[PDB]
Design a protein around this ligand. Sequence first.
Ligand code: MNH
Ligand code: MNH
Lengths: 153, 153
Amino acid sequence: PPVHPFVAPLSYLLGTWRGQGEGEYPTIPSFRYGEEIRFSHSGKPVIAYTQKTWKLESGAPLLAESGYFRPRPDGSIEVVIACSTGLVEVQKGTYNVDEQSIKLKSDLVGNASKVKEISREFELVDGKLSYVVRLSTTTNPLQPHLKAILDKL
Amino acid sequence: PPVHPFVAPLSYLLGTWRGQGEGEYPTIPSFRYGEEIRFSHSGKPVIAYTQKTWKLESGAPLLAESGYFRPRPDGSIEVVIACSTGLVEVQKGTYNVDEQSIKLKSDLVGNASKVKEISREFELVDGKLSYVVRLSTTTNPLQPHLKAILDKL
Ligand code: MNH
Ligand code: MNH
C-alpha cells in the first residue's frame, strides 16, 4: 500500500536496522548489547515498530518490544510500546523534519515496579539511527540508561 | 530455542491462526472482520503476540496490535498489549490447563478517550482459538465488544 500522508515525513525510518548499544544506571554495572529494529506500515497513519536485543558475543536473546508510532502533520507524535519485561509506555512528543529527530516523553509507564518516567529520543545521523533512552525512578531523576546506533540494512 | 518451562503449558498457542470475528456495542452497528494472530517465543518465559484485522471482502487492512504474554507456574499470567489505535493495556488473570483457557482483565488501559476497562478471554475449542473481548466506558458497563474464532494454520 502507499505510504499514508501522515507517515511520509518519517519514511526514512521504514526498513530494518541493526547495530549495538550500551546501558548504564547509577545502581548497575554498564553493559553492551546488539539491537535490531523494524519499522513497517500498512497504509494507515501508523508505523509498526518491532525491536529485539541480544548478547553481542553469542547472539543469545535478551529482550524485545513492539508498538506503534502515530505522527501527525503538525509535528506531534504519539508512540505506544509494550515490552517483553511486562511494561507498557505511552510516549508523546514531536518530530522535526529538518533535524530528522523524534523527541518523546512518557505520559504513562504501566506495570513498572520502579520506573516512573521514560524519555526516548531518536536522531538520524549520517544515515544511521541513533537513540537515547532516559529513565527515572522515585529516587533517581531522569537520566541516561540506553544509547544505541543502528545501520540501515 | 527450547520452550521455556513457564511457556510450555501454553505451547498450544504457538503458531499462526486465522479466522473471522464480529464486533458490537450499544452505540454502534455490528460489524465483521478477518483476523490473524501469531504467537512465538525466543526461549524466555514470554510469548510474543502479534495480530491484525482486515475487511472480509477485500482484505483491506483495519487494525493491528502486539504484545507479550507472561505465564507463571501458579497459573497466573500478565499480558501487555500495544494497539495501532494508540491504546495500551496491562491485562492480568489466570490460565487453566484442563480447560485450555486464559481469562484476563485490565489493570490499566492507557491513552484511551472513552474505554475504562477491557477483559479478554481465550478458549481452545476443538482445536480452534476462540476469544471474547469485553469493554466498559464511564457510562457503559463491561459487556461484549468482539468475538472471534480462528483456525490454526
Ligand atoms: C525502555 C525499557 C527499559 C526500562 C524501563 C529499563 C529499566 C531498568 C531498571 C528500572 C533497572 C534497575 C534499576 C534500579 O534502580 O534498580 C534496569 C537495569 C538493567 N537493565 Mn534496563 N535494559 C533494557 C531496557 C530497559 N530497562 C534493555 C533493552 C536491556 C538489555 C538488552 C537492559 C538491561 C539491563 C540490565 C542488564 C540491568 C541490570 C540488572 C538489574 O538490576 O535488573 N533497567
Ligand atoms: C481491544 C481493542 C478495542 C478497543 C478498546 C475498542 C473500542 C471501541 C470504542 C470505545 C468504540 C466506540 C464506542 C463508544 O461508546 O463511542 C468502538 C467502536 C468501533 N470499533 Mn472497536 N474495534 C476493534 C477493537 C477495539 N475497539 C477492532 C479490532 C475492530 C475492527 C478490526 C474494531 C471496530 C470498531 C468499529 C468499526 C467501531 C464503530 C466506529 C466508532 O464508533 O468509532 N470500539
